């Protein structure tokens with residue numbers, strides 16, 4: 001019996017009946033798109049995030065893209081993005097025609113270094129795109145201070161941070177503009193692709209409802225250009241159930257995280273995640289860093305432990321960004337991260353003893 | 369009990385059991401994206417379409433857009449579109465960075481007029497985007513010829529034409545490049561958004577699989593830029609079932625169509641839809657034309673009949689484009705269709721009697737009026 005990285009089936013199994021019923025409900029409704037499930041989810045998700053509006057879309061990527069779009073970002077604009085993140089973050093900027101400008105993470109936290117952000121700002125800069133990587137919130141007060149002083153917008157990539165808190169407030173609260181993914185493996189996931197943009201701005205909320213719907217807010221009418229990026233009634237129905245358990249599931253993750261942080265303490269060659277001050281991380285991913293990453297991975301594999309790497313290739317070095325990003329060596333932080341990082345099993349369906357088993361193996365290796 | 373325009377619920381009911389099971393299987397599989405269902409559906413669909421490959425995506429708009437992108441179409445490029453079509457057709461083009469260039473349909477056929485294309489070809493023209501509107505195929509032979517002569521690609525908008533035939537061939541057959549929508553209300557629909565691109569080109573197929581998946585064909589690798597545009601396992605499973613009944617269901621629409629054509633014969637003010645020669649329409653929509661359609665619709669409503677208009681505003685006149693399209697009065701065909709069309713209830717769940725009822729009301733209005 002192996003230790004799985006993240007059991008999707010178990011999420012279904014835990015709420016089988018409720019899940020089956022919601023789906024059955026949608027089926028019987030004869031309403032599959034832009035229905036009451038979506039409205040209910042949005043309402044519920046908005047309140048959860050301590051904000052006014054939730055606009056369900058098709059995926060975390062569109063969420064980011066439509067948010068930037070709705071904020072008027074496009075060609076000739078620069079959007080500061082993190083050098084250390086998942087490629088989609090950059091892709092969403094690219095998709096709008098705007099230019100992504102990478103900024104290195106903090107020396108101790110996998111998020112955007114505020115000090116380094118300021119330096120990257122230019123007259124073409126229009127927005128900051130911090131990513132609350134692995135469920136860890138970036139230094140929002142600092143970034144906001146900067147944004148205000150430079151007249152920039154802030155679109156948050158909260159795809160790995162559902163429910164997290166920064167200085168006691170939910171990610172996406174108030175005047176925030178935050179994008180989320182409901183991809184099956186996310187903290188809050190469904191059985192297909194899904195996403196959302198949360199915002200406290202009524203005009204932005206309106207544009208998003210339009211942009212995700214062929215630029216229309218009335219049948220047969222198309223006021224602006226737009227696309228097809230919606231969250232199905234089926235998925236939304238399921239989301240409503242998961243949402244009700246979100247805090248509890250994240251709680252489970254935190255508990256597991258405490259174990260790892262405690263059991264992995266003081267190990268040679270094992271760099272542990274640092275929780276930023278006044279933050280409540282959601283541990284979408286539990287990451288460790290070591291110079292002998294490949295070795296540790298194999299050892300874990302040998303010990304029957306499933307792992308993933310987030311991410312083996314720094315965005316700037318992916319062929320997808322060939323000829324457009326800084327040269328290797330020019331983003332050493334992202335580079336070192338990519339080569340040292342490993343994700344340990346974590347989830348709301350992973351049990352204490354399983355986590356302890358993982359600790360045994362990492363320990364053995366570190367002590368090897 | 370009114371006559372519904374298109375009962376989605378009935379589609380579920382008719383296959384309730386199998387449908388239920390398909391979904392249950394997926395839930396239980398623990399695999400929700402890029403799985404067996406998608407692979408199976410793709411296989412089945414490509415075959416159905418008489419082609420080699422099917423690339424399932426999120427929507428018909430994405431399908432169109434990804435096809436164009438895959439063909440290298442973009443900024444600085446022009447794509448000839450029909451002046452009479454659903455806005456998404458132009459939107460797909462815009463989304464790539466290219467420019468949609470409208471060309472009129474035939475006078476009495478809701479498809480791109482091959483004779484007016486050439487005149488719109490420019491040095492930036494990279495493709496033709498014919499639309500098999502309402503389930504009626506556009507004149508493919510003439511279009512390919514023209515396209516071949518100009519070194520242009522052809523991306524067909526087949527969102528309303530699943531299973532139709534052109535000169536005996538399925539829409540999307542062989543070397544075609546055709547995009548479909550699986551939106552709930554389409555001829556082949558699911559319980560959410562869904563789409564697909566079919567092609568006999570192995571390279572384009574590979575590009576599309578990548579474009580729809582963040583430019584990746586392997587974990588951790590992103591060879592090229594890409595996006596997120598996938599057809600869910602749940603939706604794909606349902607679609608395999610529906611696909612199996614497609615021909616059957618389309619057959620029902622054809623019979624109703626024949627019923628309408630027959631009963632609405634001899635109504636001078638009511639323009640009836642024309643079936644081009646050598647085509648096998650799938651009648652996604654049964655459209656009649658008449659000046660005074662708003663009145664007719666009123667009449668039908670009163671008579672308890674639901675109807676729709678596809679479409680009331682021609683694309684060039686929507687605010688989304690107006691700033692960049694030809695002026696009002698310069699696209700008389702698109703304009704005339706927009707002002708005269710009316711869609712009568714049609715679908716695999718509409719019965720002969722209900723349709724008779726529709727005919728009676730139409731006849732009465734025409735007779736009064």
Ligand SMILES: [Cl-]
Nearest residue numbers: 031032033552
């Ligand atoms: Cl619907």
Ligand SMILES: [Cl-]
Nearest residue numbers: 220221455679
């Ligand atoms: Cl419309």
Ligand SMILES: [Cl-]
Nearest residue numbers: 184399400401
């Ligand atoms: Cl999955």
Ligand SMILES: [Cl-]
Nearest residue numbers: 311312588589
């Ligand atoms: Cl990756």
Ligand code: NA
Nearest residue numbers: 058193426561
């Ligand atoms: Na979807």
